[PDB]
Amino acid sequence: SIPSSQYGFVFNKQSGLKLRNDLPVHKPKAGQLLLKVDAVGLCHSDLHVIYEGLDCGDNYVMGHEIAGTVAAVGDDVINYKVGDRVACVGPNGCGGCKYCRGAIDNVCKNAFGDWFGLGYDGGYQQYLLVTRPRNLSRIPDNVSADVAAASTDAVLTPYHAIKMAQVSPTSNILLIGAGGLGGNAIQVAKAFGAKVTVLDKKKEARDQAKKLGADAVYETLPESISPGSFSACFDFVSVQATFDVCQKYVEPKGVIMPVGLGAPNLSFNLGDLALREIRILGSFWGTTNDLDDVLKLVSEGKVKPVVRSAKLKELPEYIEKLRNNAYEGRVVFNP
Amino acid sequence: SIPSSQYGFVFNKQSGLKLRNDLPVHKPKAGQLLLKVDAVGLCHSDLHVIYEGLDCGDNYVMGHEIAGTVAAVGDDVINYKVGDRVACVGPNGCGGCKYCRGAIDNVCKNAFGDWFGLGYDGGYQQYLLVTRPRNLSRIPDNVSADVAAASTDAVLTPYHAIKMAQVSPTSNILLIGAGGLGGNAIQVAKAFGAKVTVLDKKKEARDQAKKLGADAVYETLPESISPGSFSACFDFVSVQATFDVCQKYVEPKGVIMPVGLGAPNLSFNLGDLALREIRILGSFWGTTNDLDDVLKLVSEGKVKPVVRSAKLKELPEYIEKLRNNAYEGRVVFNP
Amino acid sequence: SIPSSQYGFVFNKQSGLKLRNDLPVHKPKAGQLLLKVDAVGLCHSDLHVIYEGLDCGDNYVMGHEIAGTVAAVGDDVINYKVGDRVACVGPNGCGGCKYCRGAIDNVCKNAFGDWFGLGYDGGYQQYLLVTRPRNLSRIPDNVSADVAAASTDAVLTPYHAIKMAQVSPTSNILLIGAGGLGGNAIQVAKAFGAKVTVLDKKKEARDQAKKLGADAVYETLPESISPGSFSACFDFVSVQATFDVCQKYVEPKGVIMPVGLGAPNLSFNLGDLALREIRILGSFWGTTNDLDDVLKLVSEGKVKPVVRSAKLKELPEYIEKLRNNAYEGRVVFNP
Amino acid sequence: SIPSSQYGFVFNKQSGLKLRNDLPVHKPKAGQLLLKVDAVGLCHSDLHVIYEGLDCGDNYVMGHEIAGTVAAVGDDVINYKVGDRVACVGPNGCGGCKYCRGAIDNVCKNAFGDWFGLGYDGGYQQYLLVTRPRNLSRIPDNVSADVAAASTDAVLTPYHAIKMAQVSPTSNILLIGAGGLGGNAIQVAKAFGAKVTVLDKKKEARDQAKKLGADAVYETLPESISPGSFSACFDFVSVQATFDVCQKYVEPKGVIMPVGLGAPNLSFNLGDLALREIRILGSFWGTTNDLDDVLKLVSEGKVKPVVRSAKLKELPEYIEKLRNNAYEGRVVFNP
């Protein structure tokens, strides 16, 4: 049956993220549903929230890569039934604004500060109350919870960005960072037919980037590669040093995608951006529609997320390891 | 008759901009044509180059807003003939690469730095040798040399940016700076149907902005105006302070156009740009096709450039005035 | 107060459109609301349903240009309150599908056959039950019901089409038909900044087109006009003769918009369409977001719908006049 | 050495396509070059010209899929050298109009009726005079002349259309016709990552379609496939019946690409195109930039044109087999 209480990690600004053993298990009201978390991923963004002032709100269960099984549905829920395996659409769009009707519910202003695991409660618990079921994607039968969870951000974000940049078979792109996101960016990009060059400061990540399909992998681009030669540069790190590499190597009218959140601000050379018409396109998570596209690509085997799983109570240990860039790929937790 | 020597203003990194009374006038070889300058405009970019280290080559006659009359055509040229009134397409693209064949001849790599008045010789002289006649647009009979001169940049640049921003009747835009480019941007934007709000530190510029069609003008945007409510923000100043205004007032997925070149670098808030998918689009001058459109808009009266003229030998006195923001609109010179 | 029974014109396949005196006044369930019709427009499409046997469904109150005031809201409805003046979004999207969330709720497969007044009940009655209020747009205070009504189709449709064609100040377009939609297409197009040439076989319509802002109006295009010289051709008639005019005068890569529905099938010259890459884009009504864009353009005075009002009971007399192209612009009715 | 006379096939409205053993060998004038034809392909289009009067001009050497080696260069030709292996860009744009500058040199008006082998002389000869060298693309060393010839149209045309339709990894497309163009369209579509369904009346073609990578291949779509379920429908046949299939199976807002020229006219159901906003996009050959993209994709092994070669003098025989749809893929000839 479904318990009266549960354990989970709650984030509070004065105490950080804390394990709580006596959390309530909400019973879904009309239009809501209860999701039993099967897998929740750890995104590097949680590190920015907890340790670097990335402000998303206060006192909420973290964990935004959520995959679970419908455990209970409130009155009026007809689209979902207990037993349905689903993954959460991070942005948690309101569903009624011009954004949520305009194919871009990821930037819904009403939902700003109310994202799953980033403002609103997330997956670092046993039972998640979903107030808006519209923000759910059905997980295909052949896709595991662990992979589905990673798919909601580690894959979704790169997919959304790559789609936005309109990558194609004539694309010659550069990806900076081959971690959780970068690793899936490689596979998504290859699916679009692009040539992919990867940069990463960690040898292990570089080795993995190669196994995943990257056409070229380096720690530092050789002097032999020409500046202003890439059609698109996706920066999954976003510190000034990496942004500078993108601006140097992107071709005229090419695009720079600062997906990474490694700094509060970044500067660009104005004379260069203007005269060569470089485009800096912000990209955030992904849309409800994108998620459906994504789970389909994973299901069909085009994207295989590097995932490793562990018990949810081991989370603090893995956060520490992540802080030290001590592992490759993604790690997901089973509550 | 065509003289064998001329006067003009030559820019050198060591001696700045200097008047030369012994510049050479060369009959055009095959493929080339000699243009007699009728009007050449003074753009603020010239101030950046002469006084602020904006790197635009060395050792060439300045003046990049050029309108004139063909004085001689080399053999092989059959697209133009003596007497034709034409305006120069600044970027001076090679016309044979993938950029030039791809509707973006303004970002041609082969020709990077080979720009009229900003790398290659320009209009601050009596005769300009044009080596690539393809980079000329016919001036309509009812458009004066003075107006056509201003149109090649002051009107062309903002037209190119607005067009790139896909401005429309549903647009709510903010323009910062109502000088040479700004005043014309107001008119172009109104032609596209946008609502225009202008910011300028100088009363005279605000008044002109208003006379030209701006819906609202201010020295300081009222703090009560909702942040993130403009679909596009065109910054024709580009210093850190104005860029910050753009990022604060641009709506989600909206666009920031840093057309101005007032600083070597500009920084943007990373979390804001990413989470709200803000776009920063570099825009440079205009294309050959763009200029034809611009000259048609001007001939039709949709854009009426604010212009006043003087003898080219008065350039020094006007450079100082523009440097002190002493006049409104554009100033053009007649050699 | 709210009456128990009402009058309205119900459409049935056996007996056509007949006036009823015993129509119930539905009490809105949860999530629904009751709209008191203040103004309802007569569209030419209604004639296709009544006389050309255009199958939209059967046994429903017609009238799809709807404007009114909220008379009652069921439980749960909080986005609307009795007294709110709103206009119906014709397509009546379901809201949950990928089309409705994808910025294109006008083609929602789920709501096919359930559009206001064209499958589902409409505005040719006193009180309309609104099952899905997401399909409503608030009417600005300075916009009358009568004008709002015409805005939901007469204006909305050509707006949506014109926007799709990406018209701009460089566009040279041709519109065929200056009636309900045509007259507004003229205004919306001028707003977009395009030069507009209009064709209409009726002098009174040509006279009005000129008054509305058309740059040139004719019955037949003069020989002086070159073929393939229009960037876009909007056909609000759509019979083979008018389509032929479009394909002959549209320029290479240009677009033809068969907005009109005057024929079951139309043919195009394949050789011409392929070699000159002509585009034929289908356009249907408008989206919820389009209507907000539209009502705003009207409130701002950019579009002044030629509207004339009469009492709903006079509908029959007016349908006959429309059948005979006896009047110009739109006629809307006050219940 | 270069002979003073040659043989080739000339088309005339009166005598049809006839072999000539006394054709002159043109000496290149300045800016022009002579090309030694290494391989020329037979496109079904040639049949329409010979037998069905698609009138492209008169008295010209046919054969528009051209690959060869520069035999001679006139004075001033600098970008090309004797011995350079190049493939002709069919449309043979003028290079100086707004279309050629606007990334669409394939619809250049000045060049209408002056295309390689279709108005202007083509490849069914030994030495072709190229009056406009801009319409050449370098053949990579690892691409044979036979394959390159096929790439100038059999691959280029479908590449252009597929690029235009913006196919992607989430695309579910239908291709009708698996001949010369069809077979390559399958390969190009896969490189873009789309799911492909092919239709061909001929068994051998279906069998080849399967070997080329189509996900599903049929003679007739099984009743188990839902109408309006394809994102894009490419018709490489274009007879009323195939178009009808496209209109029935394309999903809302989907696109129909009538690339085939199997009929002088085609009709579309207006009610259906309008309500489901179906798009019909004309597509013609390819652009100079498209060919560079294509030869690169071929060189990279992503597209392997099914090609079989024969002596040019055997052309009369193969034209007959093609009329009889007797062989699969493309057949190219060696002069």
Ligand SMILES: NC(=O)c1ccc[n+]([C@@H]2O[C@H](COP(=O)([O-])OP(=O)(O)OC[C@H]3O[C@@H](n4cnc5c(N)ncnc54)[C@H](O)[C@@H]3O)[C@@H](O)[C@H]2O)c1
């Ligand atoms: N824009 C969005 O919507 C969005 C969504 C998810 C994550 N993110 C951001 O993306 C970034 C990465 O997420 P992640 O989970 O993949 O982190 P990760 O820990 O899983 O992987 C990080 C990788 O970056 C590499 N790296 C770090 N600094 C580098 C440098 N200076 N040069 C080269 N390589 C470097 C590391 O070696 C590591 O392999 C984070 O900053 C996160 O906040 C953004």
Ligand SMILES: NC(=O)c1ccc[n+]([C@@H]2O[C@H](COP(=O)([O-])OP(=O)(O)OC[C@H]3O[C@@H](n4cnc5c(N)ncnc54)[C@H](O)[C@@H]3O)[C@@H](O)[C@H]2O)c1
């Ligand atoms: N991207 C391009 O291709 C391109 C082409 C031309 C010019 N530009 C750049 O555009 C900028 C303006 O060109 P211009 O000739 O119009 O300058 P201008 O001197 O003709 O007009 C400048 C205007 O900006 C206003 N202004 C200055 N600082 C301001 C501030 N902090 N806040 C608000 N308003 C301010 C001034 O009062 C004045 O009205 C220059 O930096 C120039 O280099 C760029």
Ligand SMILES: NC(=O)c1ccc[n+]([C@@H]2O[C@H](COP(=O)([O-])OP(=O)(O)OC[C@H]3O[C@@H](n4cnc5c(N)ncnc54)[C@H](O)[C@@H]3O)[C@@H](O)[C@H]2O)c1
């Ligand atoms: N696609 C859509 O979503 C949509 C929405 C509404 C209406 N429509 C269609 O648009 C068309 C017009 O609607 P309306 O209410 O504005 O019609 P209308 O009666 O209000 O105006 C019709 C005008 O077309 C002119 N006209 C008719 N035949 C002509 C011809 N052969 N040549 C030149 N001019 C001609 C008439 O003189 C008249 O001025 C109808 O066919 C309607 O079904 C389509």
Ligand SMILES: NC(=O)c1ccc[n+]([C@@H]2O[C@H](COP(=O)([O-])OP(=O)(O)OC[C@H]3O[C@@H](n4cnc5c(N)ncnc54)[C@H](O)[C@@H]3O)[C@@H](O)[C@H]2O)c1
């Ligand atoms: N628009 C352009 O720019 C362009 C460029 C080249 C060719 N084309 C046109 O494309 C068409 C095909 O060119 P091609 O060289 O590939 O022809 P092809 O002879 O090489 O191959 C034709 C294929 O179509 C199949 N087919 C014919 N009728 C069919 C039907 N009713 N249903 C299903 N399958 C059918 C045949 O079995 C054959 O496999 C021609 O009409 C040609 O004119 C257009």
Ligand SMILES: [Zn+2]
């Ligand atoms: Zn994340």
Ligand SMILES: [Zn+2]
């Ligand atoms: Zn929302």
Ligand SMILES: [Zn+2]
């Ligand atoms: Zn300038």
Ligand SMILES: [Zn+2]
């Ligand atoms: Zn170039």
Ligand SMILES: [Zn+2]
């Ligand atoms: Zn209607």
Ligand SMILES: [Zn+2]
């Ligand atoms: Zn829907």
Ligand SMILES: [Zn+2]
């Ligand atoms: Zn062909």
Ligand SMILES: [Zn+2]
């Ligand atoms: Zn041309």
